[PDB]
Amino acid sequence: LSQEMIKKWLDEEGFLRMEVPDENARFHYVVNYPEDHVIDIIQPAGKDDMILIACATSVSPEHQAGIRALSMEKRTEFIWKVRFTLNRFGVDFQLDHPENVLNSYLVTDEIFFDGLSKDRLISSIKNVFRAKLQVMWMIQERFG
Amino acid sequence: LSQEMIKKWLDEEGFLRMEVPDENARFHYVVNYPEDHVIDIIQPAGKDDMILIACATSVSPEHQAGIRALSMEKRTEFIWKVRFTLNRFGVDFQLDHPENVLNSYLVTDEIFFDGLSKDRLISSIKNVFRAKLQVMWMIQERFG
Amino acid sequence: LSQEMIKKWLDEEGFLRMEVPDENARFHYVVNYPEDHVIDIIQPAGKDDMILIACATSVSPEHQAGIRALSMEKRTEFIWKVRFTLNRFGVDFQLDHPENVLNSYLVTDEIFFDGLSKDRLISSIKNVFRAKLQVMWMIQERFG
Amino acid sequence: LSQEMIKKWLDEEGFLRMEVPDENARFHYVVNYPEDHVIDIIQPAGKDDMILIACATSVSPEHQAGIRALSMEKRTEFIWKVRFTLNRFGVDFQLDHPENVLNSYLVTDEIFFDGLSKDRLISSIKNVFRAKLQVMWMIQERFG
Description:
4 copies of one chain form a homotetramer.
Chain A: H1 2-12, E1 16-19, E2 25-32, E3 38-44, E4 50-58, H2 63-69, H3 72-86, E5 92-96, E6 104-112, H4 118-143
Pfam families (chains A, B, C, D): DUF2299
InterPro entries (chains A, B, C, D): DUF2299 (IPR018747)
Protein name (chains A, B, C, D): DUF2299 domain-containing protein
C-alpha cells in the first residue's frame, strides 16, 4: 500500500517500465529515465520502510579502451577525480576499477518513508541520474 | 486551490506579472525575478499535481560572436564547462549550440503539489535563477 | 504568532542577543553566531509569512588595501571568484566593490513560515554563516 | 521517544553498534557506518531538543609525517584546501593542526527534534561521513 503510491507515482510521470522478481526484495521496479536509461527502485528484503534508488552504469568496451592506454599514474588520477566528484552528489557509490581501469560504477540513494512523497521520490531519482551523469560526461569529455 | 495559492504567493512577492494561454498547460503564470527577468511557471496538460519552473535564456549576438571566434576545441571545452556547472544545481537543462556556439540554454526544476509550499515554491524559483545566472557570469566573465 | 517561537528558539540556543527599532520591519532580532559574530533576523514591514537571515560583512581597510595593491585585472578576477563562490551556497548576496575593490558583501536567505521550524532556522543561519565565512577565508588566505 | 526512535532506527539499518555511558549527554550511541568506521550520535546534556552527529578522525601518525615534510607554505596550502572543502558540506567542523600539521579533524551536525525523522537522521549521518571522507581521501591521494 505504501508501495502502491510509489508504483502509482512512477506511472503518473511515465517513468515505470515493469516490475521484476527479486529473491531479496519486498519488491523491485525498473524505471526508465530519461529515454531508455535504466534506474532501479528496490525495497530490500529486511526493510519495509525504505526504498533504495540504484543506477548501475557499466563503462563501455569503447571507453576502458582509453583508460587502459593511460599510465597507471593517470588512471589513479582519474579514479580520484570521479571519486571526489560523486562524493559531492549526496549519494553512495561503488566503483569497479580492477587495474584502475573503470569497468562499472553504481550510484545509490535511499529514501525512508518518514520522508517519502512524490516530490521527494522524483527528486532523488533525478539526482541519482545527474550524479552518474557527470561521471559519464567526464569519461566522455576525455575520450569522446 | 493549489492554483490560487501559487498565484497568491507569487503576487505576495511581486514575482507575478501576468498569465498567458498555453494551449499545452492547464495554466501558465509568468514571473519576473529579479526586476525584469523572465521566469515561467507551467502546469503540463496531463499533470495536475505539479508545476514546472522554466527559464530559457538566449545568449546575446555579441556573446555568440565571442564563442564563434574561438577554435572548435576552445568551444567544446566551454560547452563541457557549462554542462558540468549546471549539472550541480539540481536542475534539469537543455543547451542549444549550433556548431558548439551556445545559442540558448534552458534551465528547469519542478515541484509536485505533494510537497508544494510557499517556502519551497520561492526557493525553487531562486535556485533556477542562480543556475542560469552562473552560466551567464561565465559568458560575461570570458566575453565582457 | 510565529515571532514568539522564533524568539523562543534563538534564546534557547543562546544565539539571541537583543532587539532593535527597525522602522522597516515588523521585528528585528540581532543574533550572535558564532561567538561575537553578528547575524540579523528581519521581517519586512509588509510581510507576515517570512523572515530574513542577513549577514553584512565589511572588509577591513588592510585587506581592502591588498586588493587595492593588485592590478585592475587581478581585481576583476577576484570579484568573479567570490561571485561564483557565493552563488553555490543557495543564499542571495549584495556585492560592494567600487573599482573592483571589495568594500563589503552581504549574504541573505529567507524562510517562509510554512517551512519554519527550529531545525530549519538554526540551519538557515549556519548556512548563511558558511557562505560568508568562505569569502572571508578566500580573502585572508590571499592577504593574511 | 526521540531517543527511543533513534535507537530503533539505527538498529533497523545495522548502524547501532552500542550505547555508552556519558556524563555530559542524555544518551550516546556509537555507530558503525560504513562497516567498521565509527560515528557518535549524542544528545548534549543541557539540550532537550537536539542531537549531535559527530565523527572524530585522527590524522594517522604516518600521514602527518607526510605533511610534516611539506614546507610551511605547502602545509598552509593544505589547511586552506581542507577548510574550503569541509565548509561546502553544510557541517560544523574543527581542525587540530599543531604547526599546520593536521593532527585530527571533527565533522559535526545537529538535528533538532523539530525536524527529526529516520530519513533525516540517516542522511545526516551519511553527510557527516562523506565530508570526513573527502578530507581523508585528500590525505590519501597525496600521501597514499
